[PDB]
Amino acid sequence: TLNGGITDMLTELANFEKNVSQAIHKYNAYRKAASVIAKYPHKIKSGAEAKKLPGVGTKIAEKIDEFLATGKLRKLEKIRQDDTSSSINFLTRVSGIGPSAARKFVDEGIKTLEDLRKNEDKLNHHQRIGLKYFGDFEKRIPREEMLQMQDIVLNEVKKVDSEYIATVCGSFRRGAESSGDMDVLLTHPSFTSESTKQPKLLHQVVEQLQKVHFITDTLSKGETKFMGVCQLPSKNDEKEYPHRRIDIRLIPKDQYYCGVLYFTGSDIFNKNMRAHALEKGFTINEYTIRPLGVTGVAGEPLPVDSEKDIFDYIQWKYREPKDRSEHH
DNA sequence: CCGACGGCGCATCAGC
DNA sequence: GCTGATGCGC
DNA sequence: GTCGG
Numbered sequence: 001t002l003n004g005g006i007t008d009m010l011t012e013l014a015n016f017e018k019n020v021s022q023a024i025h026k027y028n029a030y031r032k033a034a035s036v037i038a039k040y041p042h043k044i045k046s047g048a049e050a051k052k053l054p055g056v057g058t059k060i061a062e063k064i065d066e067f068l069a070t071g072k073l074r075k076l077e078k079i080r081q082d083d084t085s086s087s088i089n090f091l092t093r094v095s096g097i098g099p100s101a102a103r104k105f106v107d108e109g110i111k112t113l114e115d116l117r118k119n120e121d122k123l124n125h126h127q128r129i130g131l132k133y134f135g136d137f138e139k140r141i142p143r144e145e146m147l148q149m150q151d152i153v154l155n156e157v158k159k160v161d162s163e164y165i166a167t168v169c170g171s172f173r174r175g176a177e178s179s180g181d182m183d184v185l186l187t188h189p190s191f192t193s194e195s196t197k198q199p200k201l202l203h204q205v206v207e208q209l210q211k212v213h214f215i216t217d218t219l220s221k222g223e224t225k226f227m228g229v230c231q232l233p234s235k236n237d238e239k240e241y242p243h244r245r246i247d248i249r250l251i252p253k254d255q256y257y258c259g260v261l262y263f264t265g266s267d268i269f270n271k272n273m274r275a276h277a278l279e280k281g282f283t284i285n286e287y288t289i290r291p292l293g294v295t296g297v298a299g300e301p302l303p304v305d306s307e308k309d310i311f312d313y314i315q316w317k318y319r320e321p322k323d324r325s326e327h328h
Numbered sequence: 329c330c331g332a333c334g335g336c337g338c339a340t341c342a343g344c
Numbered sequence: 345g346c347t348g349a350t351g352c353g354c
Numbered sequence: 355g356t357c358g359g
């Protein structure tokens with residue numbers, strides 16, 4: 001990684017602003033800058049050089065000059081020695097504990113893994129499961145395992161109803177050699193933007209995956225989105241595979257292209273693309289792309305026949321999934 | 329200078 | 345119970 | 355924290 005020291009520093013600052021300062025726009029600012037620096041194909045020699053990149057301003061340029069000259073940033077060294085910051089940054093690593101909950105636990109004297117394990121009864125369901133699998137959820141998933149997981153999900157969904165189509169998206173669809181979690185986009189002809197002709201379309205799939213012991217726990221579940229935990233079966237005498245996070249999202253069949261654009265990510269890519277759409281006078285969500293009237297009210301959905309159509313509306317050349325990651 | 333920053337599903341809570 | 349805000353996550 | 359109007 002050409003500028004890994006810099007992007008690491010900016011990521012650490014982003015996490016501080018999100019988790020401790022609760023300043024979401026500074027978090028996004030740092031992440032935007034980290035991403036543009038990550039794709040820059042030269043080893044950066046100064047802050048002024050970095051300043052020419054969109055998303056890098058005066059303050060970040062100064063931090064880059066300090067980092068290049070000293071290998072460190074005093075602001076981060078300080079943050080690293082602050083007990084309250086350190087504690088909040090740690091607690092937020094548990095799925096379900098955000099900036100607010102982290103600060104509340106710290107105020108109650110709950111600030112270590114051991115404290116959390118003593119106080120399960122103060123956690124909501126999501127948080128309890130996040131704690132249970134804390135170690136497992138920090139492990140990455142090799143692509144070879146994602147392929148085994150894909151097999152299972154696609155075959156089990158087919159057993160429920162051959163009319164379902166499940167597509168694995170996120171970093172996997174972007175060609176990543178390892179993934180943080182699994183994202184499954186689901187469609188069925190009876191669920192469209194105009195009607196739902198069958199109930200329990202998502203439920204019956206979750207149920208099948210629970211029945212075969214693939215899905216092990218549930219963080220949250222509604223009519224269109226499941227967030228939970230899964231695990232590959234292991235063989236005789238073999239150590240068990242780590243538990244993995246899995247997201248399943250049922251999308252209207254006729255809005256698949258907006259859906260898959262959304263579900264493919266990355267997060268920064270989607271934010272950047274949607275911000276560009278706004279500048280071009282459009283709004284993109286997972287369902288539709290719509291024009292904005294001068295009032296700033298979204299108009300009627302535009303025809304979409306491919307992922308590329310969405311890019312054409314906003315006057316972007318098509319980006320293949322592989323070029324939608326944070327690093328190139 | 330300064331308003332705006334992507335957009336939304338599910339869980340939880342406050343007020344009626 | 346519903347409605348709307350907040351937290352957290354994708 | 356950054357940037358376009």
Ligand SMILES: Nc1ccn([C@@H]2C[C@@H](O)[C@H](COP(=O)(O)OP(=O)(O)OP(=O)(O)O)O2)c(=O)n1
Nearest residue numbers: 170171179180181183262263264265266267270
């Ligand atoms: N804030 C976010 C987060 C995610 N997304 C979309 C929706 C989601 O499906 C897709 C992937 O998100 P994930 O958080 O799963 O991240 P990746 O798959 O890119 O990377 P990893 O799992 O290997 O760490 O990107 C998004 O619009 N906005």
Ligand SMILES: [Ca+2]
Nearest residue numbers: 170171181183
């Ligand atoms: Ca993922």
Ligand SMILES: [Ca+2]
Nearest residue numbers: 181182183247
């Ligand atoms: Ca995910």
Ligand code: NA
Nearest residue numbers: 051052053056
């Ligand atoms: Na810049």
Ligand code: NA
Nearest residue numbers: 092094096097
């Ligand atoms: Na968290």
